[PDB]
Amino acid sequence: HIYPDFPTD
Amino acid sequence: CVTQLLKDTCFEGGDITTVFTPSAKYCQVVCTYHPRCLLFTFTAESPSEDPTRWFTCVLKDSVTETLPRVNRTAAISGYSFKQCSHQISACNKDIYVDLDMKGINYNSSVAKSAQECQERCTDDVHCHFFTYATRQFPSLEHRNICLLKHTQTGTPTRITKLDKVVSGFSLKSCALSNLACIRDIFPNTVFADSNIDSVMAPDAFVCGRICTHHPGCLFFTFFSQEWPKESQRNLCLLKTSESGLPSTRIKKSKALSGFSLQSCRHSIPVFCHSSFYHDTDFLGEELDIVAAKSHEACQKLCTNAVRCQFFTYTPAQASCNEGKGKCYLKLSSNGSPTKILHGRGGISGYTLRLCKMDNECTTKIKPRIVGGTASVRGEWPWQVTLHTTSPTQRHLCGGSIIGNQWILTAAHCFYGVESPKILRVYSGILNQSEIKEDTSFFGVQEIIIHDQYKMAESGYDIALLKLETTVNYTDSQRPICLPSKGDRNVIYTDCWVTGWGYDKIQNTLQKAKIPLVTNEECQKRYRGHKITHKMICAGYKGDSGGPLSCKHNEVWHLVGITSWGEGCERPGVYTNVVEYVDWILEKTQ
Numbered sequence: 001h002i003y004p005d006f007p008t009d
Numbered sequence: 010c011v012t013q014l015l016k017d018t019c020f021e022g023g024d025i026t027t028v029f030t031p032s033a034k035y036c037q038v039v040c041t042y043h044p045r046c047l048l049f050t051f052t053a054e055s056p057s058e059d060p061t062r063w064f065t066c067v068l069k070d071s072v073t074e075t076l077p078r079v080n081r082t083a084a085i086s087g088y089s090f091k092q093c094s095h096q097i098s099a100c101n102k103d104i105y106v107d108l109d110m111k112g113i114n115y116n117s118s119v120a121k122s123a124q125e126c127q128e129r130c131t132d133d134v135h136c137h138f139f140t141y142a143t144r145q146f147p148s149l150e151h152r153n154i155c156l157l158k159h160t161q162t163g164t165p166t167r168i169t170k171l172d173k174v175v176s177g178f179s180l181k182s183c184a185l186s187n188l189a190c191i192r193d194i195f196p197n198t199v200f201a202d203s204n205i206d207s208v209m210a211p212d213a214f215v216c217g218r219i220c221t222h223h224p225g226c227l228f229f230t231f232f233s234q235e236w237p238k239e240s241q242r243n244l245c246l247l248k249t250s251e252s253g254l255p256s257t258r259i260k261k262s263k264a265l266s267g268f269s270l271q272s273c274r275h276s277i278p279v280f281c282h283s284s285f286y287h288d289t290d291f292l293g294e295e296l297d298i299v300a301a302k303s304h305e306a307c308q309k310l311c312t313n314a315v316r317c318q319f320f321t322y323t324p325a326q327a328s329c330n331e332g333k334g335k336c337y338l339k340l341s342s343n344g345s346p347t348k349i350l351h352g353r354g355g356i357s358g359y360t361l362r363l364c365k366m367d368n369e370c371t372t373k374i375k376p377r378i379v380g381g382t383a384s385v386r387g388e389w390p391w392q393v394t395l396h397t398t399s400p401t402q403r404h405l406c407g408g409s410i411i412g413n414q415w416i417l418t419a420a421h422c423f424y425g426v427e428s429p430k431i432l433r434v435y436s437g438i439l440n441q442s443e444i445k446e447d448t449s450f451f452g453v454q455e456i457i458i459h460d461q462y463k464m465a466e467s468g469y470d471i472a473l474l475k476l477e478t479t480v481n482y483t484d485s486q487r488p489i490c491l492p493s494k495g496d497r498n499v500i501y502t503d504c505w506v507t508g509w510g511y512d513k514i515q516n517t518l519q520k521a522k523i524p525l526v527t528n529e530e531c532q533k534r535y536r537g538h539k540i541t542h543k544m545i546c547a548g549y550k551g552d553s554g555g556p557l558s559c560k561h562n563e564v565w566h567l568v569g570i571t572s573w574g575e576g577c578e579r580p581g582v583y584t585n586v587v588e589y590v591d592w593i594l595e596k597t598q
């Protein structure tokens with residue numbers, strides 16, 4: 001799995 | 010060397026490449042370990058440039074070894090440490106708040122704290138850096154999430170500011186990891202897996218050392234000079250897999266295969282190749298050609314030329330001609346020969362400018378055979394004799410130099426010593442009768458005793474002495490390496506106890522090779538008291554706090570401090586140093 005980044009909001 | 014930095018200037022051109030660092034301080038480290046970088050310019054977070062320029066670390070080279078400075082806002086300049094003499098460290102304990110470092114995110118998991126996320130990055134076979142979202146992190150499903158990352162280079166591909174998060178690197182390069190190293194090298198074996206890079210290497214040891222300091226190398230395959238295909242001799246192949254282990258072991262002939270040792274980084278030579286390669290010529294770009302009497306002299310001239318990465322000396326050929334050869338100082342874009350030609354008469358090696366990036370306790374020590382029991386100066390240069398001034402100055406116990414300002418010894422050694430000030434550490438000693446009132450000695454500034462220590466038989470029997478004045482290393486006084494946490498499962502089989510027998514002292518230093526014996530085997534002999542994993546035994550003439558030193562793969566390791574022995578039959582018991590690595594490091598930096 002590749003995970004997405006953390007949210008910029 | 011211009012060691013500190015230069016706000017707020019910028020070098021002009023000469024760029025090799027551009028990378029991303031959370032700071033100039035780190036930029037300067039990347040520049041040091043890069044094989045061509047001599048200087049660099051970092052760009053800090055600032056009003057003056059778009060976000061997309063922040064954290065830009067530009068590595069550079071110049072033939073004159075410097076560049077034109079120019080004033081510029083929020084730029085920081087510096088030089089690599091290649092020019093410098095003191096030790097050089099990759100370790101970076103920095104946590105960076107509101108900084109998010111980009112890379113291939115391969116693991117998402119929940120973690121107590123940024124700390125415990127760091128422990129996870131460090132303990133993982135792929136992890137370069139992490140980002141950890143804190144419990145004040147707006148998005149409720151992202152709080153407490155520890156994201157693990159890697160890239161090609163070990164540095165992030167991008168850096169961005171992002172509130173309520175913290176990033177940091179793997180502390181593998183401080184000797185903090187628990188990941189086991191595989192020291193086993195497999196002959197006649199090739200691996201198949203993603204080839205992430207490749208170099209030419211004169212042998213499979215250089216190949217493995219390079220694999221170890223290549224951020225993305227987990228294992229490697231080396232094709233020897235005797236390999237069938239002409240085009241691939243001395244080709245060293247740097248591999249990786251997602252499993253992280255090699256999927257397959259194919260048999261073959263004249264290849265050799267093994268693993269990164271990045272976990273065991275201290276305690277193993279890595280950046281330092283001091284062998285000479287006979288009738289071998291290393292191809293690269295020529296930086297100079299000078300006259301010289303020997304290879305040794307060549308190597309020194311290379312070492313003293315900061316752009317030099319390797320050399321070839323062609324001597325007075327045969328035995329005929331003036332004993333003056335040609336020293337070709339060479340260089341490449343990656344610190345390796347572009348090609349390695351056998352059979353052309355040259356003698357080749359590498360620069361030693363490299364060698365101070367290695368742990369001081371990894372130098373060789375100049376041997377002899379065979380016995381036994383007479384030691385001599387130079388032989389056990391980490392051994393110290395630790396003296397007490399009262400009632401009258403006498404050998405209280407043994408200990409071991411492990412740091413510039415550090416001795417490792419037994420806690421039980423300081424039963425009723427009220428004060429550091431009654432203690433004398435003498436190094437370089439052989440005869441005890443050689444110590445006189447004029448003899449030079451180190452004062453102890455402080456005594457750190459494992460707090461959970463009580464009875465020697467109970468365990469936790471370990472003390473650090475911080476010395477008052479640092480030790481200037483020499484053939485007579487040199488540290489010994491701590492075992493690596495990743496060497497836990499290693500089987501030492503060249504072990505030696507040293508000391509003066511302290512009870513009734515002996516004049517000259519004693520040396521006795523002995524054998525470890527398993528805990529179980531020990532437990533069975535020591536009826537009453539338990540024997541924790543935090544001890545280790547041996548047996549089949551050293552003193553308290555004295556070293557149980559084991560030689561593995563050419564490096565000495567301090568495996569045990571002697572604590573309670575009934576032995577020289579019955580086995581001795583020892584503090585199991587490996588188990589107290591975390592502790593020693595915490596206590597010492």
Ligand SMILES: *[C@@H]1O[C@H](CO[C@@H]2O[C@@H](C)[C@@H](O)[C@@H](O)[C@@H]2O)[C@@H](O[C@H]2O[C@H](CO)[C@@H](O)[C@H](O)[C@H]2NC(C)=O)[C@H](O)[C@H]1NC(C)=O
Nearest residue numbers: 001115116117118119128129130131132133134135136157
């Ligand atoms: C993300 O990591 C999880 C934590 O396990 C550690 O993660 C890395 C440091 C890696 O070295 C791994 O081997 C470590 O053990 C991992 O899950 C493991 O632990 C969790 C509970 O914390 C548990 O849910 C899981 O069953 C455990 N076992 C294994 C070996 O992973 C998790 O799987 C990993 N994500 C993956 C592989 O997709």
Ligand SMILES: *[C@@H]1O[C@H](CO)[C@@H](O)[C@H](O)[C@H]1NC(C)=O
Nearest residue numbers: 385439440441442443516517
């Ligand atoms: C150690 O002990 C005695 C000193 O009385 C001496 O005869 C012996 O040679 C000494 N060794 C060295 C190397 O000084």
Ligand SMILES: *[C@@H]1O[C@H](CO)[C@@H](O)[C@H](O)[C@H]1NC(C)=O
Nearest residue numbers: 094479480481482483484485
């Ligand atoms: C360290 O190296 C040698 C030790 O013999 C000495 O010549 C030198 O002066 C020492 N000290 C320093 C601070 O350089």
Ligand SMILES: *[C@H]1O[C@H](CO)[C@@H](O)[C@H](O)[C@H]1NC(C)=O
Nearest residue numbers: 016017018019078079080081
């Ligand atoms: C940057 O350059 C000058 C030298 O030319 C230096 O003295 C000063 O700190 C900076 N310049 C100005 C104009 O302040």
